[PDB]
Design a protein around this ligand. Sequence first.
Ligand code: CPL
Ligand code: CPL
Ligand SMILES: *[C@@H]1O[C@H](CO)[C@@H](O[C@@H]2O[C@H](CO)[C@@H](O[C@@H]3O[C@H](CO)[C@@H](O)[C@H](O)[C@@H]3O)[C@H](O)[C@H]2NC(C)=O)[C@H](O)[C@H]1NC(C)=O
Ligand SMILES: *[C@@H]1O[C@H](CO)[C@@H](O[C@@H]2O[C@H](CO)[C@@H](O)[C@H](O)[C@H]2NC(C)=O)[C@H](O)[C@H]1NC(C)=O
Lengths: 159, 236, 60, 120, 85, 34
Amino acid sequence: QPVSWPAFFFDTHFLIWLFPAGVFLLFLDLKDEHVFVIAYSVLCSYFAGVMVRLMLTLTPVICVSAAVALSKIFDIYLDFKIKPAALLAKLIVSGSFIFYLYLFVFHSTWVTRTAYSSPSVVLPKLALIDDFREAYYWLRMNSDEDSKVAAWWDYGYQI
Amino acid sequence: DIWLSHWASTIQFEEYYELTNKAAKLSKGFSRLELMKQIQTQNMRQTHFVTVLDMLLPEGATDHYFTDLVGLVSTSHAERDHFFIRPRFPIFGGWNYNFTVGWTNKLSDFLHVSSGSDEKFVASIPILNGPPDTVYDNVELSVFLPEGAEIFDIDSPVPFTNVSIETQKSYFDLNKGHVKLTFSYRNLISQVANGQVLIKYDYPKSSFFKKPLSIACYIFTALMGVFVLKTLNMNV
Amino acid sequence: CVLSVFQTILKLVIFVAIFGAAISSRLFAVIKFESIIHEFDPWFNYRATKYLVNNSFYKF
Amino acid sequence: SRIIWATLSTFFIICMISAYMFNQIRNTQLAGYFLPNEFQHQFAIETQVMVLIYGTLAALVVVLVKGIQFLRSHLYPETKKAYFIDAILASFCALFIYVFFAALTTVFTIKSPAYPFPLL
Amino acid sequence: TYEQLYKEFHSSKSFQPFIHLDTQPKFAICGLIVTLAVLSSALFAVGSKSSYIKKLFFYTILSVIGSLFAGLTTVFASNSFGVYV
Amino acid sequence: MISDEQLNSLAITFGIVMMTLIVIYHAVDSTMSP
Ligand SMILES: CCCCC/C=C/C/C=C/CCCCCCCC(=O)O[C@H](COC(=O)CCCCCCCCCCCCCCC)COP(=O)([O-])OCC[N+](C)(C)C
Ligand SMILES: CCCCC/C=C\C/C=C\CCCCCCCC(=O)O[C@H](COC(=O)CCCCCCCCCCCCCCC)COP(=O)([O-])OCC[N+](C)(C)C
Ligand SMILES: *[C@@H]1O[C@H](CO)[C@@H](O[C@@H]2O[C@H](CO)[C@@H](O[C@@H]3O[C@H](CO)[C@@H](O)[C@H](O)[C@@H]3O)[C@H](O)[C@H]2NC(C)=O)[C@H](O)[C@H]1NC(C)=O
Ligand SMILES: *[C@@H]1O[C@H](CO)[C@@H](O[C@@H]2O[C@H](CO)[C@@H](O)[C@H](O)[C@H]2NC(C)=O)[C@H](O)[C@H]1NC(C)=O
């Protein structure tokens, strides 16, 4: 079940573009660990493109590579050691990327509060619907302890 | 279950009710449509099923909660020393419902200090606090006193079937658990079984301060072990 | 040296913030509704761990 | 060469994260460029735009980290105030990274109009 | 006796908490900082490369205070979070 | 207990403090170490 492109931005903000860049920078030094990193990156990129469940196993590498890239950038534009022109050029870039960091924090908090924090047993004009727990508890308290319940396979684990 | 705490100076009540309506059974099964129709027209008409219960708590209760065996229940409302609780389903004749209620009170109006010795406490704890017209076939009143108490005297206004003293560990109880005194009763009625169990005991300051000391001893042993294992040569 | 003790203090503080972040970012359905198990498979995981805890590791 | 492999791998990654296999598994229609108010479906051509976007963004950062010196060496080889050309080019790279991030958020808000952080 | 006790229980003295619960949060926070300060120094003491005797006589004396503060801080934080001790 | 808007503010504050400590650490390490 392939995944469309907006989901890659939905799940990682500001870190989707930095991931290819970091793979590249990690393909310029080419040490031994970097080969492992690159293989992980390519393989999981493909697998997540195909299946929408594998994005999980693709996040640890996205993160790693992103970090690497950003760190490299900082290593040049936060190393101050006067020529005020260079100071302005360092401030511009470092501030732009700290801004991006804060924006990433806000985007992440919003996404997790809006999309991945919804209960499953209770169903939320805008009232609470607790029919599943009600019916299951009735079954639990007013049925014989050795009764058999026949229902579709989707609810067997809650039943 | 009544838990007394001197450090926070609070008395926590928590009750677990196995309830059942023994009225006339429902003929022709249960029809949700008939129930909704009755609700639609029959306004404040006396019935023989349980829709809402009215628990009467002590004055100034706080932090109420109403829970079930499948999570909590959100249909509960606490006003003016009263707590209305609506079960998940209306208890008809021959149905069961096991649930839990809890709340907290100030320990100042349940524990008095003996004037004989500053370290001798007396407690009067109610026997029942529940629905206005209910019947109890079995009661187990457990009182949990702090880790260092020593029961000294006990009195119950109505006869009991068995009284026991033990210990039961709880949060941050390292040496030995809270002192747990359990009374058993058989046939109690809501409004008729009034009375206050009275429990005299001792709690010396040395037992008061033994809790932070126990926690600090645990932390100190952990630190000494970390030091030992950090100042040991295991190199080759 | 001086720096080698700073970078340590600071790092510790950082790793206390990281934790506080993650934890606080994941308790959004526990602090709004209640502490309960969410999806279908977790209910079986919970059944199995409860069985393990109640009886024995051999019986599990 | 390290550069050929690096470029090929990075291009393949950029093509893979731009939902390229979505147009292969599902048979989507080129255009009608972006399918509005649709978070899961997409025109094929959206894989050809996002790539560019991504292909630019990453590119700029690499220039920032690596080839800032090449640009001075080949654009203005005067070598009198190289430290100034460096600074100006770094500032422009940052500005363009911002512009393209803004473009990305604009297209994402097109695909999901209920997004609070559109960067512009 | 039940009546003798019931009459004993009506002694005008009533329970008065040692430290009011309303001001237990504050204390906790305060305690916390101390618990973090002194303790941390002790850990750094290890690795000083001084004599073993000095690093022990210092570690123990700094922990016999870090612990004593941390116990009280834990009690107060537990009480303030709703789990009473 | 604690409400939801408070836990949101707390999560955001934790994140901001973390990312600021990280930036300060990176600046210190990059400026004072070759
Ligand atoms: C390096 C780690 C340092 C600490 C960092 C983390 C801690 C901060 C946590 C924040 C909030 C936690 C509390 C949740 C709110 C209430 C939960 C609740 O209510 O659930 C409780 C579970 O209580 C717990 O076990 C929470 C423990 C309290 C935590 C306090 C923090 C101090 C931890 C330091 C540990 C040092 C160990 C020393 C070695 C001896 C269930 O109560 P119940 O159903 O029995 O009802 C009670 C009613 N009766 C009694 C009538 C039945
Ligand atoms: C490796 C380290 C990792 C550090 C980060 C880890 C975890 C933190 C991240 C997120 C925390 C989620 C917050 C959930 C709070 C829900 C409960 C609630 O809402 O409590 C609030 C109260 O709060 C507070 O004022 C607590 C203020 C105390 C400050 C914290 C003390 C320091 C504890 C940490 C260190 C402990 C050991 C120190 C020495 C070893 C509501 O209380 P209440 O009305 O429900 O009941 C209480 C009933 N009265 C009101 C009557 C009492
Ligand atoms: C909720 O509370 C009710 C009230 O006590 C519990 O009902 C009790 O359930 C047990 C087992 O489910 C019954 O034991 C049975 O006794 C019969 C003899 O009559 C025996 O033949 C069976 O093999 C079984 O041992 C018990 O009689 C019953 N009590 C009443 C008054 O009906 C119920 O179990 C509780 N449910 C939960 C989930 O806690
Ligand atoms: C009164 O005390 C307890 C009430 O539960 C019972 O005696 C104990 O019962 C437990 C079972 O819960 C047994 O494991 C113990 O061996 C029993 N004896 C003791 C000394 O604990 C019983 O109902 C009563 N005991 C009497 C009258 O001796």
